[PDB]
Amino acid sequence: GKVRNISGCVAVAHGVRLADVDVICSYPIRPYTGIMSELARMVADGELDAEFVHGEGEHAQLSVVYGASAAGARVFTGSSGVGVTYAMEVYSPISGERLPVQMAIADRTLDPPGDFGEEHTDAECCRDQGWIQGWASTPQEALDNTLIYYRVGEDQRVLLPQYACLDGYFVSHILGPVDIPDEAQVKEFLPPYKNHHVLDPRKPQIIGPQIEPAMGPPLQYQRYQAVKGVHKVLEEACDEFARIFGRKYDPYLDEYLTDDAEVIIFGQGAHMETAKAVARRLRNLGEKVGVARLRTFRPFPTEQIKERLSKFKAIGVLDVSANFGISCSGGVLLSELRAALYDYGDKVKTVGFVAGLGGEVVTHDEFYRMFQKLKEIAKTGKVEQTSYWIPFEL
Amino acid sequence: GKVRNISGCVAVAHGVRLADVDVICSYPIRPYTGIMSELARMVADGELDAEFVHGEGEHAQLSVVYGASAAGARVFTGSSGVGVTYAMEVYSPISGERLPVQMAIADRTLDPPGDFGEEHTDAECCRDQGWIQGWASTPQEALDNTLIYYRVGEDQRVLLPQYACLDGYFVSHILGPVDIPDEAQVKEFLPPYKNHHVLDPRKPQIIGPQIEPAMGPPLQYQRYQAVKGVHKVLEEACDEFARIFGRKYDPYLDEYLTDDAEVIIFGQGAHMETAKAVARRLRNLGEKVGVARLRTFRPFPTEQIKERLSKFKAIGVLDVSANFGISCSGGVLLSELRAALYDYGDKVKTVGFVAGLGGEVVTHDEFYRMFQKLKEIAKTGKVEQTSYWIPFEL
Amino acid sequence: MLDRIASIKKAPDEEYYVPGHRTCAGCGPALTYRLVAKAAGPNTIFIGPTGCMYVANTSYGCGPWRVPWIHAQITNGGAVASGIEAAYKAMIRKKKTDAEFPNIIVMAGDGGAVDIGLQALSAMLYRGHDVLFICYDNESYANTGIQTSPTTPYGANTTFTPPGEVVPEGKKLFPKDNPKVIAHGHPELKYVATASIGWPVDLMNKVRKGLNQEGPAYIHIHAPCPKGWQFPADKTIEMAKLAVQTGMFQLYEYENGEYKLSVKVDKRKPVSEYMKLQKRFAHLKPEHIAKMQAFVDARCAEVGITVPVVASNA
Amino acid sequence: MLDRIASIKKAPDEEYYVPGHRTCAGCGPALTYRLVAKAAGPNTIFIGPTGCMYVANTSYGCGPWRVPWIHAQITNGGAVASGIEAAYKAMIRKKKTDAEFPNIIVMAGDGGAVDIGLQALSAMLYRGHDVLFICYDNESYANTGIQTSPTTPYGANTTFTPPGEVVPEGKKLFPKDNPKVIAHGHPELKYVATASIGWPVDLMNKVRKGLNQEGPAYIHIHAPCPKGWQFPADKTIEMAKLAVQTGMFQLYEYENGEYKLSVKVDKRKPVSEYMKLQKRFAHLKPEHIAKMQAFVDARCAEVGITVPVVASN
Amino acid sequence: TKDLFAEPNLKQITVWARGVVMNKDARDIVVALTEAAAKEGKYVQAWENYVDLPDRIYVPVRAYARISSDPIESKYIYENETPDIVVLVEESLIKGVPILKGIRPGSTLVVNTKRSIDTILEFLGDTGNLAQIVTVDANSMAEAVMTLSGAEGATDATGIGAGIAAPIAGAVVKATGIVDVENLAAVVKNPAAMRRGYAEAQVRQLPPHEAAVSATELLRQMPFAGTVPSPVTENEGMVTGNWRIQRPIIDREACTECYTCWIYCPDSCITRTEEGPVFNMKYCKGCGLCTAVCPSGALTNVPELDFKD
Amino acid sequence: STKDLFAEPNLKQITVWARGVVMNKDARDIVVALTEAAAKEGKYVQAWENYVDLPDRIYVPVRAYARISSDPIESKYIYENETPDIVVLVEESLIKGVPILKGIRPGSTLVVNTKRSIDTILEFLGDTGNLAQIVTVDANSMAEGIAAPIAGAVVKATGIVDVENLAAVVKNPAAMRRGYAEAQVRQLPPHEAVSATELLRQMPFAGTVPSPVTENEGMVTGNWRIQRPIIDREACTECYTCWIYCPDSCITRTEEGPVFNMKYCKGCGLCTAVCPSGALTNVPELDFKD
């Protein structure tokens, strides 16, 4: 398709346009706002026919698309930062009612530190809600994930909402080359939304009746089984996306120079691209370093990680977040990667790096200091403290 | 002092009464409501002098006590279930402004659909917010944690809010024996609340300005340091609480028959007391089984767990929750325990048991089946799947 | 176009709210649901924000509505309804459904309409969605065990406002009057009315008139709660009627800046004749009652009820 | 008690909102804050729900208030102030502070007052806290880059309501009138008024009248935004005056069910004399302007402005 | 594994009552005898059936007792599965309610009633392992107390045992001797009423008698997302005919067919027919609203146990 | 450390300073013109607006940036150009009170849109440090937008791209070439010119700060001025209309009439616009030394 140099915001909007979304609900918060601004223009200029609902806030945004998804509309909304936490109540009702709502999150820190830049903290607060979730690291991937998450989420085997996440500023604003698909491609990839229940007076259903505790375990387990089936469907979607669009995504891990790497940095989102640039430079110096970027955060690829990343001497885990009080005092990725690789805990050394707090750039130098810590850990086979908060501690 | 057969709800209210709280903000949701009904009676009958503010909802409750704490009042509020998630936006402002708000959480399964039965899922959604957090397993401990958490949280080295959690119905409603402290004991234990900032026209301060980009990482790290300082203060508080009230709590782990145990079950809250009874009966059969009840969830006792729980052949982790999509497909406790014990992963077998879904009882028979599974794991040295969802899978 | 109902005789026989629900014997909100469902007919979608008319009606894993129904959070009834309306408009316009545009009705309790649901209500009216928003008002957070809400009358005993020597009246605060709150400042709002199960035909006619508007409507329905207000299960209708006869609740339509009173009364009974029949007021002293009377007098004058207050022989 | 101000020359000299803040040149809300602070005096606590008057004023790690101030979420301005008031009430009663009871003032933007902050405002009025809640209305979510709010006039161009062939007027919805929404049904409400920076002594007097009441007050203040409305930085006061002179904004006090009009003249200017000076209305056709006129006429009739509409020239 | 976790010295009391109108007294009986037993060093637990909450007017609700010499190991449960003492605060509960499910040999059934022991037995049918039936006219001795206090685990401002809970519990002690009558007297607000219950209570020994769903099926029964089809004529998920302490009886010779009754029934239990109003006894809760609004006297309320059917 | 390890030798940094809201397109159109002309020569380029300066405010000094390299750019994420080779000012007053020469690398070129002599400009600048050239262009007359003439002056002095390549991308080539030949270029004698631990110690408890007493030194706004208010006290009646309408509290009442605080005044011109007596006049800021 047409190749354009565009922001992640505008890339997401084209994905939403191509998916022919039926109901959108807007509200402003930096840095995701531009997504809705572009969609508002697209509706005003007739490039997309959708009901464009001015939500009174983020809680309402999610509530509006809850209602619309139950009435059979394909729906889109999004937010950032404290907007993500303000809408928290509604995430579980959406998932538990099996409504494949898509919500874009362009990351913004919570309050405090406030309105400047990104942390993954906001979206990671949602990691229990029963949603598909992953981070785009480029504007192109931002568009592609929009389409892929609609296809996987709305598949009648799944019927689960999705968080299509992208780094604030670093993906949402920074321009990048994006191959925009054409309508014929998307129509072959993305069938129209069809749920197993819908609000329709011709076929009346009662959606969400109160249950007693004894009904709790069956229904929770039912959703669990839906969650556990996502990976298979996502593999199929990634195969079809490669076939139809010509871009081949790994469903779980974007690996770079891991073939004979002895240490890698593991993490997600845009800062991993910076990690790759550092890795290549260190490789030219003869360092056997590599990078594994997590493409799919929920459901977590426990077994795929166990299988594909247990061959390294040391893994440094980047958490661009402030997950306070968590086991091992890094962030969430460190705890979940260790849980995944637990059987290899004696051989595969792991350590967490917390950096990019408050939207700071994770710089080439900081990554250098990360790879150099891993090099040391690999040689001695010992980890001194389970986390380093950069740049205060490393 | 006086011993009464009271619910966890009334126990908490006595703790609040004894703490001479200045501002209380109320709102109803089963099963925590009884806490606010008793406090309301206490206020109307003159047993406690406090502003009793009728919140319009849980977001408001947390916001009212945020404001009251910044004005120098000791504050109290609480909720359950979707009330906890509706107030999500406010937790980070409270922590980040170092206001030692105490929130009581009587757990309840999140929507959908409506279900009054408990899961720890609701409070676990808050695990990143930068709060002190732990589960009481009896009404006595519910009262006692109320006092301890004010002590620790209001300490000028800490100044962090606290989630005083207790199992819904099982602790909140079911009557149990409680030794109610008298005013002299509390006055010796709990100093008046004094923060480093306060809204006062005589000494004007600007609380929460927009900080410059470069100051994000130091503000986050500053709070990280405060979080990392909690344990030492909690250890001191438990020591003083033993001396003053005559009840000695472990700051981290409530252990039962672990000295010679080959396998243990690790978890938190009321259901762990059931686990103890099952362990005692199995001991009569010759089984060397034990129980470790986690008293402090945040900040997580990583190194304390690594040190004290690494001597077992197998640990079964009970998660009374639905943390969907999490690494290893158990719940949050399995992921964080494995992260803490990572170094011993080749030797210390771990597996997750998810039960008590939707408020269902975790039965003696279900604990029987968990212990039987751990015995097999200890014998074989094999974990075949990392989690079992009871009663569907085990 | 839903037609005027002339009388009980000419009321629709059809029930769209059927037998079988775990509502109290004598439940006023249940009767409200029955009458609203009867007036609305089959081309209707209900939205149920958490409260008695959600929990009590669907306990457990079932429900009494013949038409589609969906659960809403107590925080967001108005927003869920906005989405369903928007979805139907878009789906019909984009030709992805052959369904006709339905009646869309929120059934919110007083908490979910005046307190925690107010913001979402106001926004729905602002956006002008073709939705009827009903408040069924039982004057407490009832399903949670009877706690004070903004519509709970001055002086009422609830578990959050127990009478005591520090607070003799139990509840010190006078109630918010939500129908007047939302009646102003929302240009799209087509129709506002108050109703009562005591006058069922009046109620059903207001529901239909509200539905006939092309745009948002708000109806606030008085629904006595024998459990919460503590009166016998067979006194619910008498309580409803006495509420209006004492002016504790006013029945009207508010259109184009004017109040049109729905029920003619020549005399207004003193409020004590109403309050004495409910234990939620049993603790109150004569001076407290006099304060209630003054409040009600002002409330009545506000809507043009100018008749004298006259003690009954009964 | 805070005394009535008779004139500009007899207005207070003291500033409690001082030079130094990252607000636009000609910023209407900045002037609003200055006058409110001047009127309120030193025994005052400010609550700032997220928006320009928070972000622009505290950039970075500082502030222009001589009195104490605290950040609130845009969602909870009313609730945060409720808690400050409850605290002072309790602390004073329980003899744990010797501080005097302060002026407690919320400075919410229109987003934080009429849209996402409304529920918390209404609840604060219901509970009857002794708090002055102010909305400074710049008729958009401004700090986020100018997006439609419910006070955004019909036909206004914002990044969420751009004009286009499918939606020629840009914004099709007419605004919510928040001072009338909260003026009814809240028994504890002591005082409601609308103000404008065009009439700065009137503004400060209304603030003082609000503060003097023992209980809740709401003041809705028109504060033109040259960035968001797109007019020159030195026309902010002219814009404010024209808003009132055309009836696009009504100035009054509302008490005992009656409207006391603050500015009473023998004529009203056509809305076009106001709109044509702002590029946020540049896209509108005569049929759109006529819709605005009919709306404004209805709004003026509502508060009893019955003078004829007369072109200036 | 039921035997491994057996508590041989544990007795289970299940108290049935009518929601809202008798829930407080059921709780008080439950609170009374545990407060009494605890004065004798026994281990005790009092709770209300949480699943029955919130209580609704006339729905059958439950309160439970567990008193023990050995520490109670079955605390964190919702209900007594195998009762040794079943108490009925209201008499009509012997119709349409599983009040004898799981009772253990040598059990006692105490009934708040003014009717004969024979009559109650006429309704019960097979009493299984029940060994004692006891009747006590509690309504002659005290009132059924209603309060907004004491709900959801909160303390009861009216205290314990001022109403019919006192004489009922007195009859329990006469039945089982589970605690000393003096210790019960010490923990109730109305020892007099209790003492009359204890004194005036008829006991009869019954004639000699001789004596679950899997996890897979549970999940199999749960529909997609818990969503269900709208009912067509009735909601069989909640059949409410067994709420009745009374029913509406019509004299059709007096009926005007004004159908005032019909328009006010909250439970849609009246249908207009050419025979006149027809009352749906599958669901009717006996609220009496129809009887209260009838202008002709065609309708009257009659006690449910005046009927065999 | 890793200076040379991740160094980008072939990369040129361009910083364009403007007045917020009113000229934030002049700034952007300049960085777009130069980069579209460089991407024509086969260079790797990036052009963006300073996220740090958002949301922009009327007359606040804001920045647009350009990166031009013959190698792929690996510093894409970096918010700001820290070491600019070319500093470009859209409005002349920006030569006063603004750190436009911070981080400048040797061989750098300062371009200014102005009619004033280079000598006058240098008086305002003072120590230009590593600055090699100082360039003046009267783009305002050439736009009579100004992006093209200013872009022309940039090329003429630096030769970072070709004239015709810029001509193919500018919206007005005529005004571009005019000023490419009229830009007065002048070479200078180009002489030479905070730990995380320190950052941490600087951050107060919870970020809370004391209230100011007379002024907020955290945000000094005098350098926003394009113009300042000048009073004629022979016309002034001391009515203090100006005083009560200043949104920045920059006017004080005295015995001699209103006094204007130039440390903070933003030159919004409201005081001038509200004066009943016409005693105030807006006057260009560079007409004054202080």
Ligand SMILES: Cc1ncc(C[n+]2c(C(=O)O)sc(CCOP(=O)(O)OP(=O)([O-])O)c2C)c(N)n1
């Ligand atoms: C729950 C929530 N949602 C969005 C925002 C973002 N946000 C801002 C931010 O993050 O700094 S500033 C703003 C604008 C609010 O508009 P209004 O209340 O009208 O004030 P003003 O900016 O003065 O127009 C918004 C909307 C937020 N902070 N919290």
Ligand SMILES: [Mg+2]
């Ligand atoms: Mg209610």
Ligand SMILES: [Mg+2]
């Ligand atoms: Mg309609």
Ligand SMILES: [Mg+2]
């Ligand atoms: Mg605004």
Ligand code: NA
């Ligand atoms: Na006041």
